[PDB]
């Protein structure tokens, strides 16, 4: 019982694009290609979040 809890604002998408593009340089190529052969299904992709 209380005034309904407010779900706070998350992030404007431009900031997110900046952040993901900045993460893009942290990727290892051998390991990336090794990941790029595992058939990521729904379970596989949404279990590690």
């Amino acid at each position: 019982n209380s005034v309904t809890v407010r779900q706070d604002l998350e992030r404007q998408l431009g900031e997110l694009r900046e952040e993901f593009n900045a993460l893009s340089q942290e990727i290892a190529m051998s390991q990336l290609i090794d990941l790029a052969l595992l058939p990521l299904d729904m379970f596989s992709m949404f279990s590690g979040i």
Binding site: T4, R6, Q7, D8, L9, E10, R11, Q12, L13, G14
Partner: protein, 271 residues
């Protein structure tokens, strides 16, 4: 729009200043106090003859009067091919004049904002809300994903955040990516969602007196003075008009043809 390949060895063409003066129109916008202080019914013809000495054919120069900055800001219609706005400086109206400059020194692509039924947000830094009218009192209520308001209740406008009161023109910039509920007096105001595309090159603003205070960009980190923002100290309006006439070539040099293909409805004074 096609690629334009040019040679760096090409020869400069002769001065086109006379041709553009002959085939274009000039509009001068001045406050009513200018005509009051001048106190002469034939001053338009005197300035026209002086411009003719400068090269402009008779009738190409058009003189338009506005009561004051606040009144001029209500849908400023700029007619001629080249527009020069003589804006008197008032230390109390630094934002308002700036807003006016921001409205007329830039190209804006605007669409209607039907606030009473729709929820609006700003997508990027180029997006603003331009509201114009006799009295624009805008209150804003930021919202969240659950549609609730932040420090505001969508059902109680009294809690909406006040961003403008009794404004003839106001450019509202809010946080991007956030939906807001808007409450503005639609009877005496009209609010439009606008994107600034780029500079409007055929409009120059001459600030008569004061200091450089115009800020035509909402970004706090930039306060650029383009070549179309002039500033002249003054004590007599006749001197102001004489210096405008004498340096007309310099003023037009700082200006370029509009170049934009519009969709709006505005009359023009063209030759």
């Amino acid at each position: 729009n096609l690629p334009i390949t040019g040679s760096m060895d090409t020869a400069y063409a002769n001065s086109t200043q006379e041709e553009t003066f002959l085939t274009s129109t000039l509009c001068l916008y001045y406050p009513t106090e200018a005509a009051t202080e001048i106190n002469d019914n034939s001053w338009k013809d005197t300035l026209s003859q002086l411009f003719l000495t400068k090269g402009w054919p008779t009738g190409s120069v058009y003189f338009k009067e506005y009561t004051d900055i606040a009144s001029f800001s209500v849908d400023p219609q700029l007619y001629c091919d080249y527009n020069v706005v003589l804006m008197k400086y008032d230390a109390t109206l630094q934002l308002d004049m700036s807003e006016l400059a921001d409205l007329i020194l830039n190209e804006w692509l605007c669409n209607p904002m039907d606030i009473t039924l729709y929820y609006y947000q700003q997508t990027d830094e180029a997006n603003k809300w331009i509201s114009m009218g006799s009295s624009c009192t805008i209150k804003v209520c930021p919202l969240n994903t659950q549609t609730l308001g932040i420090g505001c209740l969508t059902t109680d406008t009294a809690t909406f955040e006040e961003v403008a009161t009794a404004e003839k023109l106001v450019i509202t910039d809010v946080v991007d990516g956030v939906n807001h509920k808007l409450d503005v007096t639609t009877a005496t105001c009209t609010i439009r969602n606008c994107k600034k595309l780029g500079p409007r090159e055929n409009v120059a603003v001459i600030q008569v007196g004061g200091s450089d205070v115009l800020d035509i960009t909402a970004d706090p980190t930039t306060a650029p003075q383009t070549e179309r923002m002039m500033r002249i100290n003054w004590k007599k309006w006749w001197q102001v008009f004489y210096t405008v006439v004498d340096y007309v070539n310099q003023i037009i040099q700082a200006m370029s043809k509009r170049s934009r293909s519009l969709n709006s409805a505005a009359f023009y004074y063209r030759i």
